[PDB]
Paper text:
The centromere binding factor 3 ([name]) complex binds the third centromere DNA element in organisms with point centromeres, such as S. cerevisiae. It is an essential complex for assembly of the kinetochore in these organisms, as it facilitates genetic centromere specification and allows association of all other kinetochore components. [name] comprises two homodimers, of [name] and [name], and a [name]-[name] heterodimer. [name] provides sequence specificity through binuclear zinc-cluster (Zn2Cys6) domains homologous to those found in GAL4-like fungal transcription factors (Lechner, 1994, MacPherson et al., 2006).
In order to identify the binding site for [name] on CBF3CCΔN we assembled a complex of CBF3CCΔN bound to a monomeric construct of [name] comprising domains 1 and 2 ([name] D1-2). Two-dimensional classification revealed high-resolution classes in which secondary structural elements could be identified, and these data generated a 4.2 Å map. Our map of the complex between CBF3CCΔN and [name] D1-2 has excellent density for the core complex and lower resolution for [name], suggesting flexibility between the two. Focused refinement of [name] D1-2 yielded a second map with improved density for [name]. The atomic model of CBF3CCΔN fits readily into our composite map, and the remaining density accommodates the crystal structure of S. cerevisiae [name] D1-2. [name] binds to the F box of [name] on the outside of the channel, and two unique structural elements of this atypical F box are responsible for the interaction. Specifically, within [name], the long insertion between α2 and α3 (approximately amino acids 30–90), which is predicted to be helical and contains stretches of conservation particularly through residues 70–90, and a turn between β2 and β3 of the antiparallel β sheet, locate to density at the interface with [name] D1-2. The interface on [name] is mediated primarily by residues at its N terminus (before Gln 44) which are also predicted to be helical, with minor contributions from the C-terminal end of α3 (Val138) and a disordered loop between α1 and α2 (Pro65–Ser72). The C-terminal residues of [name] (Glu189–Arg194) are also located at the interface. Superposition of the crystal structure of DNA-bound [name] D1-2 from the budding yeast Kluyveromyces lactis onto our model indicates that the DNA-binding site of [name] is coplanar with, and approximately perpendicular to, the CBF3CCΔN channel.
Residue numbers in the entry:
A (entry chain A): 54 to 320, 330 to 565, 588 to 608
B (entry chain B): 54 to 317, 339 to 565, 588 to 608
C (entry chain D): 4 to 30, 88 to 156, 164 to 202, 257 to 482
D (entry chain C): 4 to 38, 75 to 189
Amino acid sequence: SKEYLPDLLLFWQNYEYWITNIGLYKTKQRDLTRTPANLDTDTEECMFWMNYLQKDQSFQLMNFAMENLGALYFGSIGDISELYLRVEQYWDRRADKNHSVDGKYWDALIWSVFTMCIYYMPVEKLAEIFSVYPLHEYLGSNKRLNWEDGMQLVMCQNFARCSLFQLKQCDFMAHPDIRLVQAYLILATTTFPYDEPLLANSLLTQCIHTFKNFHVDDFRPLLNDDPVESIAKVTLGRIFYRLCGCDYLQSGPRKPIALHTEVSSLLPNVDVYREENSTEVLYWKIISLDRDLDQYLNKSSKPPLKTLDAIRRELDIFQYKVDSLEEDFRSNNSRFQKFIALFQISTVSWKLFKMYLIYYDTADSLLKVIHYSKVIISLIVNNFHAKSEFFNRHPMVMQTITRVVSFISFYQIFVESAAVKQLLVDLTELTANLPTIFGSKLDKLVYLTERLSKLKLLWDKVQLLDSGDSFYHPVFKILQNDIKIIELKNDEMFSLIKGLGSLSDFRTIVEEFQSEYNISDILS
Amino acid sequence: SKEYLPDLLLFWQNYEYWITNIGLYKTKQRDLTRTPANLDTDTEECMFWMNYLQKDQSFQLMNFAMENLGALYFGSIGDISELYLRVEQYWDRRADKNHSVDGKYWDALIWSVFTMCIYYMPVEKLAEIFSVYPLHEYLGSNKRLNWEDGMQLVMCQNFARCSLFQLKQCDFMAHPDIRLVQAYLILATTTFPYDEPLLANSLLTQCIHTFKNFHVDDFRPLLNDDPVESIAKVTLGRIFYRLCGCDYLQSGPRKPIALHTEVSNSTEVLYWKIISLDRDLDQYLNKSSKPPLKTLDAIRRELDIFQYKVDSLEEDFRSNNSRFQKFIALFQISTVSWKLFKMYLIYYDTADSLLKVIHYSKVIISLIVNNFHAKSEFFNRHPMVMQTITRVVSFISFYQIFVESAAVKQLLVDLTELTANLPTIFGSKLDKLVYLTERLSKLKLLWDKVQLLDSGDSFYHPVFKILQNDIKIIELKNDEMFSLIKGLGSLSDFRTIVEEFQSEYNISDILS
Amino acid sequence: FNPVRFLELPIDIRKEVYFHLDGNFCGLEYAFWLRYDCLVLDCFKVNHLYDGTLIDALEWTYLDNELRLAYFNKASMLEVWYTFKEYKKWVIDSVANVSNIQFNIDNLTPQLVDKCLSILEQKDLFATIGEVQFGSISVIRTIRSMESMKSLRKITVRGEKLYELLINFHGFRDNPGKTISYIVKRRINEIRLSRMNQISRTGLADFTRWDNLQKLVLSRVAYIDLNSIVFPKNFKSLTMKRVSKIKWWNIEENILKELKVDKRTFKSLYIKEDDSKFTKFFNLRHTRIKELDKSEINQITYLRCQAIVWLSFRTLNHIKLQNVSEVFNNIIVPRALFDSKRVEIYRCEKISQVLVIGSRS
Amino acid sequence: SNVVLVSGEGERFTVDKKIAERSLLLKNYLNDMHDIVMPVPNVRSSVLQKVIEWAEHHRDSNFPDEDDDDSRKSAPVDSWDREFLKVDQEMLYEIILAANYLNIKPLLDAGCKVVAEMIRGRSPEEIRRTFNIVNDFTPEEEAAIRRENE
């Protein structure tokens, strides 16, 4: 019999929630009796990584971001030609021995902008601007590494830490101001929310508290307002919808305080149909389609087909709006905006037809999954060319492939097909050719896929037993115990007790495979 | 006509929400272009102010807390003889070079306990323990200042700041743990929520994040549980109910992330039930609506039930912890009773209301004057008597402005005499309370010397326009739109009397 | 025709087959065997499987001295009829809890409406019934029973005799038994109207009493006036079927009273520049939409124009229009409901002027 | 500039880009980056040739909308479409499967209207009196119905 498949596809939703989503990005094994305390206070380290930079290097980073990366910061900070004055003021106020809170806020904002500049610059321009040598003079690592060898990410993470250190010098908890939130919306474009998810959740809770301090709900200005007040409300609305997007991209069992009062498209105090659609709320609408799909992962109920068909209709509507974006390609900012919107709309299409395949098994759903996987392959391989390799550095290409190359692996364990194997070979070709800036995270993904490849072999050599009621095989036990182990590793009761307390060949094959390929290797 | 009295008593709800609560205690005038961003991050300050404390002095602080302060820390840390081991570990580990995060959490907890010891200690033992002279050698102030001048408040603020500095060395943002909530609830016993208000709001939002990290929503022990887990869930329930209490004691416009999901071992449950009754009373300050009579009658019936429960409580004379608990519980239930009959007087104008207000006001005065003797003077240092006496003297002065009575006048003289006799550990809040009482008395003189007029539809008097402009100025001062604009870019004889009163008796003097 | 390959055919294509096959299951009728087809049970299994977004016209009737579910055609001819245990058994077959069942008053007799309500109340449930179709003894008999009607979400009211008594706020009378009981008005999520001529005559069309409206349907009405109608808090949708000449909002008269500019000079102020990017997808071909020029206005004045547009347009998500054949006062809609596919006009060749305000950036 | 579709059997067909924009998939598979061949699996080449001929017929026809649920009900049974889909049943279902895969709403609507006219006018009391996929029907219930038939 081949009727074990629908319950196993329904088990994929639980496995995708706990292994691929939570346990790979959003779980950090902490142990408070072993972490070193912050007695350095990041003072010597960020003192070095602040006086390492020079002035001409900073203005070249600003010119690079001015002519390339505008689709990321243009909703957050606005127009960056205003910020050249702030860079001049930083390089003039660097010699001052008494700083103000406002000046240090502007300095933290431009250091976050520099962190994004370091994250999205290709290795050739970064080697022509910066020098490899004094970092190896300082960091004490191996003196043979280059920028393409894994030292660009170290400089990016240390610039993010220096932005956070300049936030620490403000007493940012005692002075709530908007330059926290904007700075986090520049730091939420790197892999900073995936490096330290605990610190990202704490800063994001501070950003939610800082935003809700202003008590602004409607960003449509009124008729009895200062013109400055109306421009302030427009910029605050753009910051708000970018903050909602960067807020949904970190959800899970460690993020309890939601900002999600934004009502999704036609199932809620902020109904998102009333704003004039700029880039930021368009990105939020695509993230809202994503969040309306991926709430049924850990839930036991099944999604209605009414909802999935509404998602299909609105998916085609925003698909056509991306075509009718209509900007000038000579400035190439619209090129990167078009890539972001097109990759997100292909991701949401893929998740829609994955849920079509799993929950209801509709007309050629697997074939549409293969088709949109090939579309994602096309949209990533097309940017293997020159001058636009860094387009493959926006973090959503790390998420979506992690959703794809797991699932097409998992289905390959149980249903043998011809197109699926060639698609898996294409994904295995694509996974190694992703940029090396995702580092260890990228490495972990390959390990997961490799484990699933080995999980095909144990499916083949072992015969499926039968009890009449339910089915029994070691693959089922191992896939169950993976979710059991990672749900055990997200239980903070033992942290509470460390706080204020005083403290059959079936089983053999399962213990052999879990002793050989442990799932806890993917935990951060 | 004489119709201004009910609408003016309804105006008192607005004035009591903004001026006596948000303006005096919960508003900090900030300026970001002039405030020194401390690049040192208080390392030079707290390094000295932690080298000032000595070991045997700290153990005498812990002994005083064990003897006399149990009804405060029992909600947060339970028993303090269990904490002596952690104090020993800190004093042995202090001489090291490296440190661990869990140790620094225990250090933040015991420094918060030290702050609670300093804030409630009487002045004679505090003078016998600590010197006065290195304080003025560091601060550069007068050598002739004493503890009653205000140096004990300065030492309390510096210990709170050094506890926060130990929290900042933990990177408590990137490492949530339950000792943050306990070390904040010990710092919530003082007037640290009134020195730095939005810093306390940020710490309380961090504590709400740290609590909801655990995902425990029901605190009852099951059968298949580890008993350690059941003890942990009971203790976490205690911390949750007291955290709801200290959350309600910091509400307002500058704190929108609230924990109040609960609606309406025996002591903490009694304490939260009294505070929740207080919450259901004072939820009608900022609102434009009015409570029904059935609501106030149910509050009165439950008030009599908890009055009998406090009458069912005991007291011990050799154990001062029991008298401290008894005074706190009886003062809380008397404050809730006074606020209930104040709402009776304001909203419905029911007979036998003002006599009940004077009755429970004299009960509050008797509970304070009973502690004016020896051996129990520090009972008046709890923040609830500052809040309660602020509301009482404000409402009695506002009632004396517009309604004359001899018993009310003698009550006002008693409140005014007791107001200057409050201890000097409240300091600037006490001075601004005296200034607000003096401003309302001069407003009474202005009400006396100026005729009330009427154009045929509504009344007109300078007192009404001044009391309205106070609320309008403080609602203008509690807006962050100007800070948002500065963040985005760098972009008749009647009127004469009103402007002279506003130019002489300014409203911005009660702010911070 | 092979009904065994048609059933192994997948779900949504078979749905699209039944989408064009709504009422006419046959084509006078041999109603004995027509119920027990596999295709009819397939229709109702798929119809229960989505939400009820197909035919959905399931009535309670008292036929053959028995209370049973019944489906009526588009011309109100009886197609199928189920005993409730049968329909429960095959809904359980589909799902491997019913709550959406319509209730006419117009397609029934009051001497059996009373018995239907009495035995339906005292028998087991008096629940699982969503819509209530009004449009006078039987009406008052139904009103007395709606207090126990736990899960209803819809009210349809037919022509103007029954509307002004029940729905509009104008009365405020002293008859509690005649009108609603204010617990049924809390869960009243949609309201449809039909078979009338004027909604706002002899008073004012005010919906302020009815809280919690997320949709509204105006069908086959002669003359309405949007300027007269006010709307509740938390109002979402607005759908209008085939109507005659109607008046729209006073938005253009408020822009004309803002800039202090004339009508003919405003007709040279409405640009028609950005009509070839995305509005070609709208497939209008009759209404050429027009916007305001960016060079002929300031920034803050344009934001104030948007603020004037959102006044008397406070909370609305989508406006749906069938053939209306005329609109008097100068359609000028916001782009935030026009740039997405929310403002949807479908069959209007007689309409010509659509103005749209907002940035298309 | 021509666009090549690929069938399931392997025969590569060639149409124009403006012709291929009748499909709501070529319009979103070719619009990746402007700085040519689309595979269609599991479609026999005759079926894709018929779909291509249908797309070449209606090059300048105004179809109603995408979300007009009442214009689909008020059905235009087009003359060339009714002449076109007059094939046997399996060819018709393969065309409808191809139109669902190619995301072409009007051909899907026309095919489903043809199948709806087939299923509407079934033989009364001949095929409707024979239920044939008999499940959730006991022999007791079937015997009860066949006893209630007389």
